[PDB]
Symmetry: C3
Subunit: 341 residues, 3 copies
Amino acid sequence: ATFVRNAWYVAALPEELSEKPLGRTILDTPLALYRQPDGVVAALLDICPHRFAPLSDGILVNGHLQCPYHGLEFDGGGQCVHNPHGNGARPASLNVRSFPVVERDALIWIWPGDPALADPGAIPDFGCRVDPAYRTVGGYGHVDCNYKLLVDNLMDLGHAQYVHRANAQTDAFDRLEREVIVGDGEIQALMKIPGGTPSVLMAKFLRGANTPVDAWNDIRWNKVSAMLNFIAVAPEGTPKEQSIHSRGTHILTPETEASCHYFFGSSRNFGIDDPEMDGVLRSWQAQALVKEDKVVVEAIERRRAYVEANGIRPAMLSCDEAAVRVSREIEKLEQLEAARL
Amino acid sequence: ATFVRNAWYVAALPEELSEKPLGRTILDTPLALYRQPDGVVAALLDICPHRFAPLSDGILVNGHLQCPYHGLEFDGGGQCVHNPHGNGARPASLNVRSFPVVERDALIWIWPGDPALADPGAIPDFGCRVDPAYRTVGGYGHVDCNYKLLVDNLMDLGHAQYVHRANAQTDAFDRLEREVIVGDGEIQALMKIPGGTPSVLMAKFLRGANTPVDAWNDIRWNKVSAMLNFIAVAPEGTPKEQSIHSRGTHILTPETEASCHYFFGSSRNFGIDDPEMDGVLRSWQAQALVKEDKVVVEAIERRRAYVEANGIRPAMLSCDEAAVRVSREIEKLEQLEAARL
Amino acid sequence: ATFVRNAWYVAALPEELSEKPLGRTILDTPLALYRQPDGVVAALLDICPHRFAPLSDGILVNGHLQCPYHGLEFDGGGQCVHNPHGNGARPASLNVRSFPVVERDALIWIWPGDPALADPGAIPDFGCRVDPAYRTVGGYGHVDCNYKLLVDNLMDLGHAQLEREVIVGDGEIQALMKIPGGTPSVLMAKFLRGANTPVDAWNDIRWNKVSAMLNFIAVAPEGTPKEQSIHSRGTHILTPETEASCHYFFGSSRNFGIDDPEMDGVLRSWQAQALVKEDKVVVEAIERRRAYVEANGIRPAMLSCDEAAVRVSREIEKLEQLEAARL
Ligand SMILES: COc1c(Cl)ccc(Cl)c1C(=O)O
Ligand SMILES: COc1c(Cl)ccc(Cl)c1C(=O)O
Ligand code: FES
Ligand code: FES
Ligand code: FES
Ligand SMILES: [Fe+3]
Ligand SMILES: [Fe+3]
């Protein structure tokens, strides 16, 4: 019920779309997502103007989505291009809502609010995902929790030390150094674990290479819920700019008030042509983000009723600065909109 | 929550009942339906007056339904005929509600509203179901949608062109001619598809007959949600009367506000003694009515919250006349009751 | 939504707890139940004060439960004993609620209400469960019905077909039934292979504040004190989970065939000792009909066998009102 509608959200990964429509709900709005014959992606309200049937269950005819119930056909703009009934007239009332959609950086961005306020120049920058110098692998995940819980999770990558201990635990955690940068529509949480033994996973990034290492876990947040992290590890004490790293795509899109879509990926500049390294990253993604994080956040969502019924508020720790700031920016965006209508 | 209680509804097909009670919910009312030893069907509120146990889980004793919890026995009138506890007294408070029920035309009709207003002369006529000149086959189906969505579906038989695309397909759909006839508690939609290629179904009807054909697809609606259609097809261009036909039973009974029972059947006057034609009708029903229709309407029900939250109203086409009229008669009946009671 | 919070409820059987926390909901309150290294059971609100993660999914560190999300560690009192972040300060806001818990009679009792009113002297007496003269076997069961339906069932003395007698005390109610000789079938199956000749049967049940019951099933030759008879005291305790679901703790404490594995298996069966499948179908079915009975104005029609149940039911209702009246 409480969403920030005026903003770009990822609705799907390119590989998920085709001429066969995908039905997906974004911010409590059912959408029919498909790629037209010319390759351009279209996003229509998944509700036929005639009798509300799911257009996503239909097929393309002459490149146009055909409602499976009574045959009305629509173009990517939501305009009804064919009515096989009676005089076959096509009054404006037969047009269906179409959403602004942009395919960029191997992501399908959608604007669920006022289409007049849709500005592609405001789409977060995830260029590394299509940078030939980087190798990108990732996937999709559905989680039964409010998207904000996952934003919190990610804005404190420090949870890895426990929730993903088997892979990310470090014996230098106590020596953690952290800063928070607030910018124009952007917040960054910087983390540096100095001179520690590489973690199981960082050891894999360096290929079983132990030796005293330096690690960085930064994360950038952009308006609403799009984040890109910086996971780097380098021996002794080398520069952070000359180190091996992975820029992780971590984007959340609310489905319902208590559920969300999770788009994740890894864009690395090492072992670029190595199927095994691809396996490590995918294995990590499947185990950490899709299961371990899922377990915790889904359990937290189940306890929301109790915390709200009672007057329980969270007790912040020294690692929550970035998360609280992001959280407050989102709350402000919610309030602005609530004040628009 | 919103039902027209003062009307006869089909609660079950005769073959569904026996001495073993059937538990079924009609208009949010749980019923225990069974056939007594003398063969007369009884309908009791499926809630024991003692501690609310489901009488439908009990068995008959001396022809009386015995509650499975503590043994109170009831007769078809809902009267408690035996109390095995203490002095075994049977105060009126132990009687359970019994509903007016009539077995006619191979259908079990029940009156869930004001019992004093129940009048068997008001039961729709489905005589063809027990006419020795007709061969009748059918069945039952449960659907997760408000019953009105299925009334719309049936009153707008045209959808078969796209929904049943593989069976009811017709190359004369654009040469369609409709005719609506209004009446008291009765509305009829007539449709004709002359001089065209028969669909696979009609083909199987005329035993794979060659040459063009003249079909007939009418449907009659009676107060609330009981319909009988007329599917006729004839060699080339012959009369509508002498034509081989099937009178289809299509009756809906709401279960909950978002779910309903669907009683269907075919009463044909051709291939009467042919197990195969039987298979042709049973297959169609299983395929078209239970599978294909189910999908479309259940998806529409899931989109109700969104259309209501927003102010979306349906955009009617030239094929919606009969459906809109029926829909308006039902709405009026709802209003009368809402007023009346 | 409607619970009597100020009372002791069984949250688990001893054998269910260990250093690996058990997550369980009691009266709509999620709990993390575990046994510390010294063997003492602890019960914490299963909600970390930091960001609400389930402590029940964590593990013990130095004998302290560690939240699986960001590592805060707590002691059995709910006090935060370690914060691995920043200056590692531990302000009182990091403490988590801890519930009064007592392990007695091979049962884990918890007080979910006003912690100030909790008094261990008020815990029902189930001593037979740890009496060396008795052999006790039992188990756990979950049921999708309001706990009151099971209280009714039990107060209707194993109805699966001096004399009558119902005693009403304070926070306690007993229903006694002594049946000389027999008419349908007596002597009982287990009691069979012991004590013959004319006998006397016994089937009583004791109810204690809210939903804890202990029954008495016994038999002895002609005239004989129910004390020295061949008997079994059945533990039948219910603890609401949600308004429409509950936990069922059951057990048998017998003084016969004490060293005989044969009987344990049957005396440990959920269907044979707590509720036959056929009856479980009934209480869950009754729960599904609550909406209809409430929507309409349907009230139950009592029979001659409902006396004990109605009385217990009325004592519970009074307890509900007392608490409600507070707030
Ligand atoms: C969750 O953030 C990560 C951490 Cl903490 C370590 C390694 C990786 Cl690949 C990621 C990632 O971006 O998925
Ligand atoms: C759905 O109504 C029908 C149509 Cl449109 C064509 C053929 C048949 Cl058999 C039926 C039927 O009664 O099921
Ligand atoms: S509901 Fe889409 S054409 Fe009828
Ligand atoms: S609930 Fe039917 S006899 Fe007791
Ligand atoms: S939620 Fe428990 S330490 Fe953060
Ligand atoms: Fe994580
Ligand atoms: Fe259909």
